[PDB]
Symmetry: C5
Amino acid sequence: APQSITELCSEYHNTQIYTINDKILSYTESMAGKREMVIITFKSGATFQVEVPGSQHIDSQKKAIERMKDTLRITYLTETKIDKLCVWNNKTPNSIAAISMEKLAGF
Amino acid sequence: APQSITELCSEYHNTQIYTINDKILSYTESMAGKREMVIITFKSGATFQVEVPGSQHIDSQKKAIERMKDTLRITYLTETKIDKLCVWNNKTPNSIAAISMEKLAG
Amino acid sequence: APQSITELCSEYHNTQIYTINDKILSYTESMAGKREMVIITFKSGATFQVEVPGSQHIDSQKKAIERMKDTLRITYLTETKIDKLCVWNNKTPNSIAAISMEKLAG
Amino acid sequence: APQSITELCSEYHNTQIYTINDKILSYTESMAGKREMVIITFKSGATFQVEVPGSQHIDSQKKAIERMKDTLRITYLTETKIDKLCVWNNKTPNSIAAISMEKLAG
Amino acid sequence: APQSITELCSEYHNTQIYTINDKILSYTESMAGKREMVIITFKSGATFQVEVPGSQHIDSQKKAIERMKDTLRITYLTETKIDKLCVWNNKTPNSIAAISMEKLAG
C-alpha cells in the first residue's frame, strides 16, 4: 500500500497532485436529481468536485465517496488547512481522488 | 459537471437561487409519521424545507437527502453562514436542492 | 408541508407542543435489549423519550428515529437551547415527534 | 418506558448502576478480528466495555451498540462528564447497557 | 474480553504495540479505486494505515474499519493525543488494529 498521497496518485492514469496548502473557500452541496455532488473551491480559483456515483464507480468506492464528502464538509466547517489533492484532471471540474492534510509545527 | 451552485440550479425547471448570506435562524426536525422532514428559517422571514422522501425523488437522491439534513443541522449548531440556496419554488415551503457556503471570512 | 413545528404538531392526534426554551439537563442512552432508547430531561422536571422502534412506527420513520437521537446527543453536548418540542402525550414519558431550536443572538 | 437510567437498570438481571461522576480517562478501540469492541476506563480504576456483537444481542440492539460506541468516543474527545452507567456485571470487564450524563450539576 | 489494548494486541500474531504519545501529524484519505484507505503519520516519522477492505477482513470487521477511519479523522481534526497503537507489522505501512488515547492531558 502507498505510504503517501503523491505515491498513491502515481498509481493511476489521468490523476495529478495539486498542492493546495489552504483552507476551503466554498462548500457546495447538491441533492438535486442526477446532480448529487459536492463542489469545493479555494481562493486560488481552483474548483473541485466529488462526482456523482453515476454509472461507474466500484463497490469499494461507494462508501469512500460518502466519506470524502463528509470529510470535505467538516474540513470546511472547521476551517482546516488542506495540504494536497490527488485529482482526476480528465473531468470538469477536476474530480477528487484523495486528500491530505498536514498539521506542521506547533507540536 | 457544474462548477457552481448557480450553474447547477440553471439545469433544472422550477428552481431558483436565493442569496441568503446569513446564518440559520431556526432548525426544526420531525420524525412524525409521514413527515420526517427539516424546516429551516432565517431572520429575513424566508422558510425552507428538505421535503419528505417520496416518489418524486430517485434512488441516488436518497442519501443526498440525508446528507442535506445532516448539513443543515451542523450548519445551524456551528452558526455557519450560508451563502446561497438553490431551491424548488413550486413547493411550500420552498424545497432545498443545493446549498453553498463561502468562507470569505478568512 | 408545514412551515412550523407548531403547524406540524397540529396534524396529529395525541400530540402537543411544549415550549422548552432551555438546554437539555440530562442525556440517557440505552442499548439494553428491548429498551433501545434515549431519555432527555430538563431543569423544569420535564422528561421525554425517543421510544424504541416497534410496530407503532412506519417503514420510512426508521432513520428519522436515529436522526432524532443523534440530534438529542449533539444538542446535549453542545449545550444548545431547545425552543419547542412536539410530543405524543399518550405515552410515558412523552415521546418526541419533532424538535425546534432558534439561536436568537448575535 | 423508564424515566431514569436507574429505573431502566432495574428491569434487567445481572445489571448494576455505577455512579461514575467523572470524565473518561482512556478510550480504547479495536477493529481486530473477533475483538471489535471499545474499552473505557476512569481514574477510579474502573474499566468497562461495549462487547462484541454476537448472539446475546438481538437485531434491535445492533445499531444501539454502534450508537453507544459513538457516544463513548465523542464523550471522551469532548471530555464530557459521565454521571452513571448501567452495566452487566456478569461480564469481564463490565459491559455497558446504558449511560447518563447530567449538565449544570453544581 | 481484554481490559487493555496491550492485552488485546497480545491475542494476535504479527501484531505489536507502538507507544505513540503524540497527536497525528498528517491525515491522508483516498477514495481512489482499489486504494480506499487512510494513512496517518506522526512527527516521529512513523506511518500507519487502515488497509483496504478485502479477504483479510471478516464480515464482523467491516464496520469496525469504517469506525477506525472515522476515529482517525476526528482525532486528527481535534488534535487529540494518541497514546498507543496496536498494529500488524507484517504489512506496509503497518496496519492499525487498535488505538488507545489517555486523558489527564491530551
